[PDB]
Symmetry: D2
Subunit: 407 residues, 4 copies
């Protein structure tokens, strides 16, 4: 008997998650999927749509409580968004007036998002740990930072951080070369939204050169960049390496949050009567990453998945306990890190810097300290100068006063 | 186009290796297998037997030189025995006179086997390196020790040490639980002939406790580890550990019986005679290392990804041991590459043995590189099963006299 | 105001310690030295002798309790022997019948000595921690193993393990070259009673070769021959003999009186002399480990001032030997200044030395774990891991014997 | 015993020689030999030197670098590759891209390094194949040059010095009325990128009191910053932590190099006739004291640039760091300090990665890899400005560096 808990069932991505679950239900047994959400009305619409898609292939349940969802669960998926789109709007917009990048996961936006998430994830990991001891698969942002927090501070081992960029990238290369997903093997490492690809293999063949060539054929890295750095770079690195250009673009356009308010409102209307997943829905591929991971956690085949976990030797010149986004051998409930060699100095300058920042943030959270928050904020590469840091922090703390208090 | 070189064609294990290569030739392209040996008359009988088994499914060739074999080979299998069974006989026989364990791969006998191998493998790695840059798959003993030497001193990356105990153990477990070889997954670490298993998984299920229980029911019994030992140590232990943990008992056994090398001599000589006329592999042969080699080569060729226990650099597989120790450990093998997998921490009890003989392995290598009799004494004294200071000068002199043709130290 | 507690004040070595304390009392201020011992009658004799030597240069006190000795102390010196000479006699003699080395600190003898010391040191460190938080300076054996235990399990930072073989060696070298103690600088590392010297400097000059050459014209059958030093190229702690000359040491130990029994005779003779002596008796001066005293006093001295001096002590590696984990408690040279111990960089350790250090360190930690869990099964595992431990066929009976002999001090289940 | 001085014409040379005179009582110095590419400049300086020295040791000029370092036991690097005109370009060109322009920090330090590598490579090589002297380095950027020599040229006896550690200790000793050697620091970081966590004076932890006194204008760190961060920070961090404020300051004034040029020209003219030293000034006391303590068997603490080797436990052994070392008889021993703070580690890791990318770009003479190095510096260009910035730098340093 096998049950999957979904926390944040009201999410507009839920339907693609269920499609993934339906696709794997032929290979592994799923008796029930149970949904929990703080917003009951929004989840009911979604879950009614889900019921119509499942057609009784497994049971679809709603729990009124988080504990009721997770108590008999073998897997718990975190899909919730602390503070909601209103929080994300604050995250993106507040840093702008200081001349800083405002973005959901990167920089000061990621910092306030993290402060909102930590108390909720703390409460949730404790409950899971006192009951089912499930494996937790996390999408909640910021995903890598939360993983660092849970793995090295709460010390819950079966917490796996996921993101959609690895799977989107493998998908790209597969269609480029007309091969299957698992035919693609990468040298890949970094932090969630801060990742680097060094080698690309397809069916065993080294096609790195061909990937670089194809990337060529003005918000995008120019050609000379790839020739210089020789890494395929996470698109999110644009906020670092093209800061002035990104700032100008964010600050002269509607906040991204506000725009997804409109998209979400539209999808919910469609969900009332929809018989199949609406095109306007189709980070959509997060879903396939979750379901394939659960699938390969369930069997004894042994498969490669890029996930957020402790380095443990994946990258030889980084400390073992850094949570990284890296390729692992996944089999029967365990995740094994795979040897990759040395990481490039360019990549490591980013990885170290934000690893230090994100640990300063965690410490500041754990001690509920304004002083240490300032120290965390000054350390982020896209953080404030000294002259703006106090005002910025106060603004962040006031906006997040329902979620966290620092003294 | 794809060629495999076999170095030591005359081995009496050769037919098994070729059976293996025949089995994989359906999943993987093999155009030719070429054989080399220093003993042309021995090899000729073996290869003749081989030709009757192969039946032109691939091309079978003999080369007159090492270089002729390895040029244009993608894989090179070392299965030669430096100094022959007479060397083995000196390895086993000489320590005995000093009250020391005499054994092919363990202790002083392994020391002398190492010194015999190093000059040949140093020549062979050199030629491979300057021609084909083939992956070498090593069985030549002592295999883990030779691997340490090639990886960290000659610095040739594509050198993979193999051994027979991992495969035999997995095979045992699979039949215990009625499962396939690959259904079995181990937490396994240590040195060649000095390994430990901490966890056994069959089809995902942790069956470690059941493996311990069934070892209790296994059945000369007072020459194995008693029940309480498994209860105390909580490791499944390589049977070679008996030479360390039960030294007095094992010494008594070895020194009141025919030297093993002498039984082997007789076995090999009866096989050899059967090879002159056999149309199928005989039973006196059956032994299963030559399915570890074929499977490795196969999984090195495809893009499937498969687990193999092999001798290679730790690289984080055991987190509380240095990256550069060559260990016998599970690896993910795929498309020419061998990746170490996380296993967490090693047990303090296993680590005590691993560190000590690793240090002895490096001292022996260093004594060989400087060709130093002084440094050889130092290496000998460092082995847990080595001589006391009062016996060391004489033991070394006797070993160096016996290995005159193979080793020269100043 | 500055107080030193001496735990095990009844020890026959106390008079040499006090003499060291007297030598330093000119450089650093000592107001009082307070003594504690479980044996009150034996301590009274020794302390009456001490009072006569001190001549009111500082106060000499006795505390009837451990807590009363350490409560206001800045330094606490551990000088006690858990289980006494009777315990030591069991440690030396029990292993003999199994064909094993029986010795005060090395092998099976050190294992049972550790098992007796751990509960007492737990109790004592806890009391020091809850009161004065003094720096503890340790001679109680096995000193290196107890340091490993306190530093990495009890996690009490100001616990410094000492031994007398470093200072005895430095003294030899000074005399050999006519130089002062501090003019000697060593590359030195290992475990207590398990140490190795790679380089010797005198007044900045590398004199290693001269030391090796001199070691030979030191005329016998019981010590390393000349080819050994030429092969190994390390000056080795003399305790290494039990490892590298096992067969010869076993026969020596088994064919003479147990060492503890003959020390009972030496001690009983010293105590009679202590009743009336006005000066340190010679019989004490040339024996056992008499210069431990000078090690303790110079350490305390240099912990008190801000000069900065080198002392070989037992502490965490922390980069002294780049070849070993940082947390290994090692016996190594440290820059000692104002209450702190700073490890000094030394480069790589030799493979030969490392094989010993690794092996014994793993044994040490297995023993600690077995103690902490009060586990008979884990104690077996520890015993089988020692390079001088029993074979499988002997291990159970040998553990049983040890546990019965130490039943007043520890219980394992 | 002879000392070689590479850069004899430096306007700092009189101070170095004063220091060498102060130690010549505790240690034997037979001769100090000077070399410079600018013979006319050096001649005036060395003549002034000869009047100060008064034959207490022999003072010599050599016409070649080789002539100076042959049979020297110590060799002091105090030359400035490309001169004050180099520094002017280092300071001025970044400005045009909205970047901090400064002698040793950021893009200005990048071009200074590229200018120094060819010369030090040649010099280290000559020393190694002749006398095998200890080289004491002041040539900037000193920490970066030391990373280069220790880890790429792999010449062990090369010790990087800098001015800030001694200046700090001097402030502290005066604050508490103690000697220089009474002060002990938990000190770590890179050159011009350093942090103090603990201050001890005569064994007393006076860190708290150093914080309080620092509190007792708008161009330095405010009080809350020390309360937050709890590190005493090198003043150069302002270019990182207060970039906007520093950029506005540097970009609205004459370049620092111009001030220095006027100061040096005034001093040089004074040297023609001076009988005593007139009114980084005292790094030429860290050099003499280092050489002194390398010579005796006392053992003394000096903060210097060298391999970490476990001095900071959570940093790799091979990072060259500016850290306290036990100095005795030709050797430099690192001392245990425990762990480094995450905040200071973020800076150290980043600039260290940038340092190695820069050296790697130099060794392969690669324009491509230089762009990579430039992009990696926390104070480097955005992608949109990188190609032009690099071209401008390469154009300016035509005579010293050539990249393909
Ligand atoms: N890592 C990735 O590639 C990736 C991709 C997409 C989304 N995400 C993250 O997943 C989350 C999904 O958010 P979304 O885009 O659907 O926006 P959203 O705000 O609509 O969030 C989804 C649901 O979470 C619920 N929720 C909020 N807080 C909760 C809590 N404390 N407990 C239970 N439920 C709670 C809300 O009611 C909402 O229905 C966000 O954190 C988002 O950033 C991550
Ligand atoms: N590390 C070294 O180089 C070194 C050198 C000399 C002695 N030691 C050790 O120091 C200790 C001193 O022993 P010793 O040789 O003087 O002989 P000893 O056996 O006579 O013991 C010293 C005194 O300690 C007292 N004592 C025993 N247990 C005690 C306890 N639990 N609390 C307080 N006092 C206690 C006894 O009454 C005795 O008078 C021993 O452990 C010895 O091995 C170590
Ligand atoms: O702008 P949105 O529709 O909210 O999507 C934003 C999403 O972009 C993806 O690339 C990231 O991996 C997600 O973690 C992120 O949340
Ligand atoms: O037999 P003993 O007189 O008691 O001597 C035993 C002493 O020997 C010394 O070499 C050791 O360093 C001491 O730790 C030990 O206490
Ligand atoms: Mn993502
Ligand atoms: Mn009493
Ligand atoms: Mn009593
Ligand atoms: Mn001792």
């Amino acid at each position: 008997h096998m049950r999957i808990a979904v926390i944040g069932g009201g999410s507009s991505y839920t339907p693609e998650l269920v499609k993934g679950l339906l696709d794997i239900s032929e290979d592994v047994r799923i008796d029930e999927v149970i949904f929990y959400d703080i917003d009951e009305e929004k989840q009911k619409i979604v879950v009614d749509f889900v019921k119509r898609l499942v057609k009784d292939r497994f049971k679809v349940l709603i729990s009124d409580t988080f504990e009721g969802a997770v108590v008999d669960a073998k897997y718990v998926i975190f899909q919730f968004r602390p503070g909601g789109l209103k929080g994300r709007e604050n995250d993106e917009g507040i840093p702008l007036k200081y001349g800083l990048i405002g973005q959901e996961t990167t920089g000061v936006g990621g910092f306030s998002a993290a402060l909102r998430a930590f108390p909720i994830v703390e409460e949730y990991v404790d409950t899971v740990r006192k009951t089912s001891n499930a494996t937790i698969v996390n999408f909640t942002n910021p995903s890598g930072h939360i993983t660092e927090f849970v793995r090295n501070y709460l010390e819950y081992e079966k917490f796996i951080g996921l993101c959609n960029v690895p799977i989107n990238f493998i998908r790209e290369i597969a269609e480029m070369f007309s091969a299957r997903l698992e035919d693609v093997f990468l040298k890949y490492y970094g932090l969630n939204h801060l990742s680097f690809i060094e080698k690309v293999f397809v069916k065993g063949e080294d096609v790195t050169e061909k990937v670089f060539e194809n990337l060529k054929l003005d918000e995008d890295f120019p050609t000379w960049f790839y020739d210089s750095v020789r890494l395929i770079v996470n698109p999110y690195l644009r906020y670092y390496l093209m800061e002035k250009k990104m700032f100008k673009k964010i600050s002269t356009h509607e906040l991204r949050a506000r725009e997804v308010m409109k998209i979400e409102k539209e999808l919910f209307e469609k969900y009332r009567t929809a018989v199949e997943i609406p095109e306007e829905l189709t980070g959509s591929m997060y879903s396939t990453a979750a379901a394939h991971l659960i699938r390969d956690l369930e069997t004894d085949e042994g498969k490669i998945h890029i996930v957020n976990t402790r380095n443990n030797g994946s990258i030889e010149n980084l400390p073992d306990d850094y949570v990284l986004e890296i390729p692992c051998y996944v089999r029967s409930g365990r995740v094994h890190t795979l040897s990759q060699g040395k990481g490039d100095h360019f990549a490591l300058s980013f990885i170290h810097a934000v690893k230090m920042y994100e640990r300063l943030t965690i410490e500041a959270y754990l001690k509920r300290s304004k002083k240490l928050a300032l120290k965390a904020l000054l350390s982020h590469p896209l953080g404030p100068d000294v002259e703006d840091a106090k005002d910025l922090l106060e603004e962040i703390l006031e906006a997040n006063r329902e979620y966290v208090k620092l003294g």
